[PDB]
Structure 1
């Protein structure tokens, strides 16, 4: 979608692993605010949005 009409998707009720993301997308930019990616596979969350 375009920025002024971005698309949002709710992801919850599932087993999430953030180690497979490194595969997809050469990752021209990959940075986090408030968390660090290496520790992200560990914490537990309420409801994750995309």
Structure 2
């Protein structure tokens, strides 16, 4: 929730878990991958 005052996301999608349960869980072996793409290429960042 600290992000609410500083960031706005055009895309936010979650797989394997409901977005409304995130606050009630603990997560194992967490990694974050970062990069930059073009606007039309964002849709390609998804399974399949």
Tell me the TM-score normalised to structure 1 length.
0.44
Tell me the TM-score normalised to structure 2 length.
0.45
Higher relative contact order (CA 8 A, sep 6+): 1
- Higher CA-based Rg: 2
